[PDB]
Amino acid sequence: PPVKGRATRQRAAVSAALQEVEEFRSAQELHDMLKHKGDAVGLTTVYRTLQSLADAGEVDVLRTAEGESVYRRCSTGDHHHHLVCRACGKAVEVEGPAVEKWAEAIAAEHGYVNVAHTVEIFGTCADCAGA
């Protein structure tokens, strides 16, 4: 995830942390893990970095049930949706043109100019049910 400004070891470290993992996580959890592995990087610094990255769109954002935003560096850059298990945090890249066509059709029927759909599916793995 290249940054608009000059690259610095803190930005490189947070980028390495983002690409290191695949689950969704907020600023606090990534701050914890980067400090524990030996980065010593600021909370507001990582917050600003992920704000800039989300503005660039290199990462993907998701508001949890409480409300806090979690972020995942997704491999696929095209339009896509994520199936997320809260017990595991794993994200599966799922994309469907049917929902996009439905959104376009309902927007056209209602005469709406632009459509910005938020579609999230929350579930549990089969292993989660098993003990």
Q: Hunting for tokens 């997320």 — which residue is that?
A: 84
First to last CA, the chain: 38
Q: Between 83 and 88, name the residue whose CB sits nearer to Zn ion.
A: 88
Q: Between 40 and 65, name the residue whose CB sits nearer to Zn ion.
A: 65
Residue 66 marked ligand-binding? no
The residue count for binding a copy of itself (CB under 8 A) is: 34
HEC string of 17-55 equals: HHHHCCCCECHHHHHHHHHHHCCCCCHHHHHHHHHHHHH
User: Can residue 115 be called a binding residue for Zn ion (CB under 5 A)?
Assistant: no
Dihedral angle computed from the Cα positions of residues 38, 44, 45 and 51, in that order, rounded to the nearest 10 degrees: 120
How many residues can be counted in the chain?
Answer: 131
For residue 118, the minimal CB distance to Zn ion (Å) is 9
User: Can residue 88 be called a binding residue for a copy of itself (CB under 8 A)?
Assistant: no
When binding is defined by CB under 5 A, the residue of 15, 25, 59, 60 that contacts Zn ion is 60
Q: Between 37 and 101, name the residue whose CB sits nearer to a copy of itself.
A: 101
> Taking CB under 5 A as the rule, which mask of x and - marks residues 71-90 in contact with Zn ion?
---x-x--------x-xx--
d(C-alpha 120, C-alpha 16), whole Å? 26
Extract the annotated binding site: 60, 74, 79-82, 85, 88, 93, 95, 100, 117, 125, 127-128
